Amino acid sequence: MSPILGYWKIKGLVQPTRLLLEYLEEKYEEHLYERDEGDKWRNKKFELGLEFPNLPYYIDGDVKLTQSMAIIRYIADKHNMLGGCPKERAEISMLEGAVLDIRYGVSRIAYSKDFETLKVDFLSKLPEMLKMFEDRLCHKTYLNGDHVTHPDFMLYDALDVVLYMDPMCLDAFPKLVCFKKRIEAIPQIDKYLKSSKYIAWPLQGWQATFGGGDHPPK
Amino acid sequence: MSPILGYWKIKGLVQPTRLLLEYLEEKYEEHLYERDEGDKWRNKKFELGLEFPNLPYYIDGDVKLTQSMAIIRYIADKHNMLGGCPKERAEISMLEGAVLDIRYGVSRIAYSKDFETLKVDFLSKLPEMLKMFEDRLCHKTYLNGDHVTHPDFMLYDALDVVLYMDPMCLDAFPKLVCFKKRIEAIPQIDKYLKSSKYIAWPLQGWQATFGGGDHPPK
DSSP, X not given: OOOEXXXXXXXXXXXXXXXXXXXXXXXXXXXXXXXXXXXXXXXXXTTSOOSSOOSSEEEOSSOEEOOHHHHHHHHHHTXXXXXXXXHHHHHHHHHHHHHHHHHHHHHHHTTOTTHHHHHHHHHTTHHHHHHHHHHHTTSOSBTTBSSOOHHHHHHHHHHHHHHHHOTTTTTTOHHHHHHHHHHHTSHHHHHHHHSSSOOOOOSSOTTOSSSOTTSOOO | OOXXXXXXXXXXXXXXXXXXXXXXXXOOEEEEXXXXXXXXXXXXXXXXXXXXXOSSEEEOSSXXXXXXXXXXXXXXXXXXXXXXXXXXHHHHHHHHHHHHHHHHHHHHHXXXXXXXXXXXXXXXXXXXXXHHHHHHTTXXXXXXXXXXXXXXXXXXXXXXXXXXXXXXXXXTOHHHHHHHHHHHTSHHHHHHHHSSSOOOOOSSOTTOSSSOTTSOOO
């Protein structure tokens, strides 16, 4: 039957996976845990059949899975989007890891009380990481050419997130700005972002120093 | 000709990749940057042909690569070790990500001046992460059965590293202790660990608050 995706009701780690499932027009069900609901999770945690229990989880009936990169690579694998030969596979994993540098970079420093002095240091590395993708897109429509791969939806969620932290970071990167409007003009993604299912905030878990609460940026 | 692997002369991010190349008896060359040599790196950085310049890099002549998970997945891919069908592939990526939780968990908190109050908090989550692998090995020789996969060499380097941080964390986890002696009894790995090429320290870059310098634990 329909797979289950389970996570906190935040963007977090699972947001690139939802956009991929949306692009692909795949049916899936979500178990969302709200913030008062830690207890729900800790009870179900061990009775779900996961060998490495954690959130997000993905259950299929062929598969019971818990790492967010194992889940989005599996859904893309199932649709033949993962690579092709070792070299194409490795290219897509290098794109994957270069956007995890920007995204887990926000996460490292969110939740520290020192976020504000941490902000300034992260933001001075960010333009060199951004220039690498701006140059990649110089001749491509999507990160690996004319076709959408799962790293495209990971880079859309990282640009969405560093723009709350500094609204001006993409001025200077015009290809990156068009790539963001290009993902939003994909009709399945436009429909989802206007949906009742879209979760616009928080970015991080509700207790972070940046991207938490039920708010406003920085 | 022989591939080049380039990194700082530390264990860091590349240590599971070296043990895999050693298990596999593959020839490779290393460009090691010592600590006074940042400048060397920053000069060569842009003249190497990498689309996403960073350390480690892996050059092949079929491939020029820079994310440490794209490099170790490629060498394993080339030897058919990566998976088999979507489900086997996803299993190996979930193992990958469950040991990156322990390893990038040491890294997050190393380099903070607050490492000491950060230590105590990480160490109280560590036994639940460790129990998941102890239970995985309860009926297996290696993490995915009777055959070594690259996640095995990632879990060996994470157990090596949390044992400098708390020498007693594996007392209670006897399968995990035997798994560590079992990887060291693999003859290619025994030979390498007695080698002139083995880099025993630092664990992190030489400036970290834990695993840095040219030292001693914690």
